Structures are given as C-alpha cells and as structure tokens.
Amino acid sequence: ISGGDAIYSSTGRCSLGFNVRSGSTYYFLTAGHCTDGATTWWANSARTTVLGTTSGSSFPNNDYGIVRYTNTTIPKDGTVGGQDITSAANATVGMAVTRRGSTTGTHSGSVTALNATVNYGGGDVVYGMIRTNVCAEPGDSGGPLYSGTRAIGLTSGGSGNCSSGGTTFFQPVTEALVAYGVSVY
Amino acid sequence: PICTNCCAGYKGCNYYSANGAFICEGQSDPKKPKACPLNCDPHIAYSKCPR
Ligand SMILES: [Ca+2]
Known part of the structure; x- marks a missing residue:
C-alpha cells in the first residue's frame, strides 16, 4: 500500500x-x-x-x-503510487505539485497561497493550510501532495471537482x- | 455506494442511509462551491435530487 x-x-x-x-x-x-x-x-x-x-x-x-x-x-x-518519496519539504508559492487520492487518482497543479485559514463550517476551522489549484473530491482526504520526490502535504479539503476544476487545501x-x-x- | 458528505453534496439533493433514513440535504452550490473536508461519510449510501 x-x-x-x-x-x-x-x-x-x-x-x-x-x-x-x-x-x-x-x-x-x-x-x-x-x-x-x-x-x-x-x-x-x-x-x-x-x-x-x-x-x-x-x-x-x-x-x-x-x-x-x-x-x-x-x-x-515509501512512495505515492509509482513515485518514490525520499524527503519532506515546505511548500513555496509557485511550486509545481501533484496529489494522488483514492477517488480521483493523480492530478497536478501549483501552490497559490501559504498559511490559509479555512472554515469548513460547523465550528471546524483549520489554519496554516497550503492553498492550490489542484482539484480533489470526497474520498481524496488524507492523500499526499508531493513535488518530485519531496513529500509536501496531506489533503484536507476543497471546493469544485476534477471535472470542472477546484481549489484544494493541504496540511503541511x-x-x-x-x-x-x-x-x- | 456513493462517496460524499453533507458539506460536499449538492443543494437540491437529499442523501440517505442504506436503510432509507434521510441524512441531510447537500450544502454545496455548483455555482458558488464552498470549501469542505473530503472524506466519504459512512452513513450516506445514495441520493435523490427531486425534480
Ligand atoms: Ca521512499
């Protein structure tokens, strides 16, 4: 696995x-x-x-x-599907990243903002999130965000979908x- | 079954358990989507979007 x-x-x-x-x-x-x-x-x-x-x-x-x-x-x-992971790093705006998840598979995008605050509603607020333009859908939660062989984040949440485009938030x-x-x- | 949660499901759609209990109506507006956690809720088995 x-x-x-x-x-x-x-x-x-x-x-x-x-x-x-x-x-x-x-x-x-x-x-x-x-x-x-x-x-x-x-x-x-x-x-x-x-x-x-x-x-x-x-x-x-x-x-x-x-x-x-x-x-x-x-x-x-210690991989993401076929991609080997060798170390962990901090995201930077402009970083080219890929996410893999059990619902949508592998999708690519970039980091567009750092330290985002996200309100999921119902009293659930998260801080310090990495914002990207990579899409994700329910089931994708927890999946890896990586850049080459560097581990960058864990899928936390998003809006939109892999058919129309979305915004996805990741925990560093x-x-x-x-x-x-x-x-x- | 389907994989969704009350946050990510769509306004206008009802989500039910395998036994037919209404769990929630979706909260996302296709046109103005909100940020939601992305897990599959274990209680929703299907949906119906009344027309
Ligand atoms: Ca490895």
Missing part, C-alpha cells in the same frame, strides 16, 4: 497520505478529520484486511493523524512529522 490508496474505518473512507517510520516501527499519515473517532483501519471495503490502529489525531486547528501498522505482511512502500506534512517524531522514507 502507498500514498493515495484507499483506507477504510468506522469514520468512512479516506486516502493514505505517506508511509513514515520511527526506527523500525511503521505508521502512515492521513487527515485528522479521518482519524478523529476512528480506531481500526482496513485496506479493503470488505474490511477484512487490517492495516493498524489510530495513534494520534489533530483536527480541527490542524488536519493530521497517524495510524500505527499492526499488519506485518502488507507492503508499506512537516508539521505532522515533527509532532509525531517520524520520517518519510
């Missing part, structure tokens, strides 16, 4: 962000709104292939969460990596 693949739990379906580790212990990052209230994660809609258990969640304010792998046999590729990955003391590989 890799960045952008589907992940299922009691909270519904989201996308895996990045496969990360701490020494020899593996986890995956995804959106905090997806981990909020979830316990077990499965790799299939039948919910028969276990992935792991939620270990942290930060939403709203931020939008990041981490799941500890409990399944020793599933491949845990560096902030979650630092918060949990893990790294991409």
